[PDB]
Protein: Mandelate racemase/muconate lactonizing enzyme, N-terminal domain protein
Organism: Novosphingobium aromaticivorans
Amino acid sequence: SSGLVPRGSHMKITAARVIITCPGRNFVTLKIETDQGVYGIGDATLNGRELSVVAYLQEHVAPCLIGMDPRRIEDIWQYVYRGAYWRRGPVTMRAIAAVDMALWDIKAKMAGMPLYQLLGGRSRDGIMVYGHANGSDIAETVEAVGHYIDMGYKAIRAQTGVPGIKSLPSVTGWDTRKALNYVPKLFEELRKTYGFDHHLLHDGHHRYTPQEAANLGKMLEPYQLFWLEDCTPAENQEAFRLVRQHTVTPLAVGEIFNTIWDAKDLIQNQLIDYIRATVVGAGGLTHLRRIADLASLYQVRTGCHGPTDLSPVTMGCALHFDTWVPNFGIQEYMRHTEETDAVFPHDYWFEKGELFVGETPGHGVDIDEELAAKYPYKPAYLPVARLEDGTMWNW
Amino acid sequence: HMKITAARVIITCPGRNFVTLKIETDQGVYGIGDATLNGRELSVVAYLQEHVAPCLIGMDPRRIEDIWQYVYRGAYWRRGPVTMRAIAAVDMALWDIKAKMAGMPLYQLLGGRSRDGIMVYGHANGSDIAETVEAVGHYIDMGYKAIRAQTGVPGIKSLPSVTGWDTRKALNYVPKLFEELRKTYGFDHHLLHDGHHRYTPQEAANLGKMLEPYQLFWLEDCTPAENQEAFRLVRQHTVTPLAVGEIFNTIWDAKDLIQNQLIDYIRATVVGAGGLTHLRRIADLASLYQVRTGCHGPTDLSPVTMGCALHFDTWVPNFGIQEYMRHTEETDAVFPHDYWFEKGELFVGETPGHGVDIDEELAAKYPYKPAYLPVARLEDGTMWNW
Ligand SMILES: O=C(O)[C@@H](O)[C@@H](O)[C@H](O)[C@H](O)CO
Ligand SMILES: O=C(O)[C@@H](O)[C@@H](O)[C@H](O)[C@H](O)CO
Ligand SMILES: [Mg+2]
Ligand SMILES: [Mg+2]
Ligand SMILES: [Mg+2]
């Protein structure tokens, strides 16, 4: 135990500080300190819009937290969620997520337990991950998939450039017919080359209409994909209906979701197989648990998004979540830079296509503030996409 | 072509906080847009100043739609209070430039005028029924056609203030307010009530039925609506008209409430829901089901929003009502505008643009001052919906 407060005594948040660092890329971290001595940290990173969350926390949320009882995780979650008045949203839920992660960090430290024990204990040993096999064309993407296979990955996401298709935001091009003609040939070549033992994933990256996604999903059926992800924009939760009606290719969505309200109909109408919402994107452990539980009712599984723009603090929480959650499906894993790992020392590790969470009380991650200050913030944007005629599209 | 040369964020507190975006061009003409998000103001300041504004530099400001789609889709993480306030500010400023370049007041570009004056409602508040009745009388005396009546409830009570709430106490008391209002003033005046997210769907249904004899103009925000099915039970059980949406920020928050015919008035605003570009889409969807606009309009939407809202209200075919809370004199001076109030109606002027501007020199004399919205808890301490 990090130290329990005496029975009948109070505990207060004394500080809620935002720390910004760029050890390879931008990360925002909230550190909640207490009068007991124990502290907790949470990820607040919102890629390409980082400083909006910094201000949300520093100027608005943090001053409200001071003096509050950090043990009251649920109450504080409801306070910042309901109390915002303007509810939901990428910036809002990142701030909430940062607070929630930091508070669960504190509770696990005080309990003298790794976080997964507080959530209900372990349901599995290792956490299956997928890696990112990218190529400019099919031949190259095929070779990249082989590399991940050699490395012992059980699951691989395969993405290829399409011939004829191409810090401020980089502008990229897109054409759907070109992709529809080419993408199924990638998966054909992959199965010809490697057979059917490995899980193969594809990210449609919001590019298709529902009918087009249905078309693509059908064309991919002979290749038995693990999932086709983010096939069509999903602000309208009815957008997956035609896709689900027409294909048995499994469907995943939700890396950009921030509350259960973004996913409730996709889940209850059985339009998806994997929910991709994350601890940082969707309001911390407190809220992600709700999302996972609703999904479980329909046998929908978790497939947490996990690019490098979710810091190791997020990964730590994600792995504790993954270790416990009964309807675990898979965990995305893109490796952070060495500098990032140094700034955020953590008790999780990778081995032969699986991540494993450690037994350190808390979520097992910390932040080296002295080292973090050596890497100053540097603006960086996500790309945008335009159609061939110049139409603004979904990158 | 024509280019954006700057997109600057201006912050001022002439009575309360306002955030404004000013888009300047290499053709001299500029436009302004409201970015104010009450109680979280500085988050939008950063969203704009640190992220969106640098992307705008060099873009063609004539391309309103393209820029909207750029900031909307390009964000990658879509929708949200902060996100859409930033988008709205850009959109208002670009429509301002377009109308200035056209030599026309903004309502002309939207489709021209559909009406003369804009019916408003004001806020008659009281600590109890007697006081609230007196206040409605005052608004009636001032020539208001429509009045929102809110009473404190006996037994129910900068950092956020913590207020109390008890549903049973309110269900027992609120209908009596409207009984007394109709007994005292008759049925000529439109009477409105804001449930302010306090009730479950069944409780809202119960309240709605109890309010039926009093013929309300609307019962607003009766139950939290993140779940768009939340209004189903209410609509099934009462003919009291329903309004919702001041806190919505995209059409995705309202599409089912509209298409399933669960509401009569959509309350989304120019600043809340992504500018003229997006609010037009919301109003048009609403029109298919005879749902009307009821734009939210408290003091925390700046005169820039009010200018845009009034241009919108002057054109939009399915207009219902416009909320109006008066800004301070200081605010009117900081934001020179061509709209005015007379005998229960607002009127937009004919100045090219949305008709609002900002005096930056004067704005600098009122520094930002942190202020929070209240929170509500139940009698047992449960965090609730203020
Ligand atoms: O599934 C994925 O990994 C991608 O969709 C993400 O890498 C996404 O593009 C980034 O997280 C955006 O910050
Ligand atoms: O309908 C209304 O006027 C109220 O709901 C608003 O005054 C609301 O409380 C504020 O706009 C919050 O900023
Ligand atoms: Mg993805
Ligand atoms: Mg209201
Ligand atoms: Mg009936």
